[PDB]
Amino acid sequence: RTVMVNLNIHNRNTNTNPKRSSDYYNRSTSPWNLHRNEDPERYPSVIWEAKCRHLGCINADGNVDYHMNSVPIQQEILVLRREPPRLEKILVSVGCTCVTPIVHHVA
Ligand SMILES: CN1C(=O)[C@@H](NC(=O)[C@@H](NC(=O)c2cc(Cl)c(Cl)[nH]2)C2CCCCC2)COc2ccccc21
Ligand SMILES: [Cl-]
Numbered sequence: 001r002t003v004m005v006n007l008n009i010h011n012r013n014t015n016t017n018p019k020r021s022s023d024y025y026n027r028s029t030s031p032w033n034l035h036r037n038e039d040p041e042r043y044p045s046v047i048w049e050a051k052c053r054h055l056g057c058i059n060a061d062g063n064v065d066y067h068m069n070s071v072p073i074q075q076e077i078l079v080l081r082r083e084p085p086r087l088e089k090i091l092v093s094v095g096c097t098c099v100t101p102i103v104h105h106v107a
Pocket of ligand 1: 013034046047049075077092093095
């Protein structure tokens with residue numbers, strides 16, 4: 001039911017320095033690696049998702065504390081998918097945080 005938009009530089013990645021962000025977040029007690037989620041039937045075709053590096057959280061000494069748990073923060077965002085092969089909502093991991101597990105550790 002919706003119409004026209006211009007796909008250009010104002011709606012695609014122009015960040016050429018991802019290491020600036022990763023070096024900064026690598027100082028987190030719950031740091032993360034990145035999954036390159038590519039789907040050619042989707043706009044952005046590439047979505048970078050956080051994958052927690054550790055099961056526990058990194059302490060002041062540089063060691064892992066297994067009393068805590070590094071966990072993916074989830075968010076729901078909109079993506080365009082090709083119609084015919086349309087606006088779709090998807091759940092994505094946006095980063096990691098350090099939590100005190102109430103029941104189990106998310107692995
Ligand atoms: C690591 N990384 C990113 O995250 C990039 N972001 C995106 O390409 C796209 N957003 C994500 O993927 C994203 C959003 C959420 Cl919410 C999660 Cl989760 N993921 C973004 C591009 C611009 C249009 C809208 C989508 C930007 O910097 C980079 C540069 C080079 C290589 C990797 C990265
Ligand atoms: Cl890429």
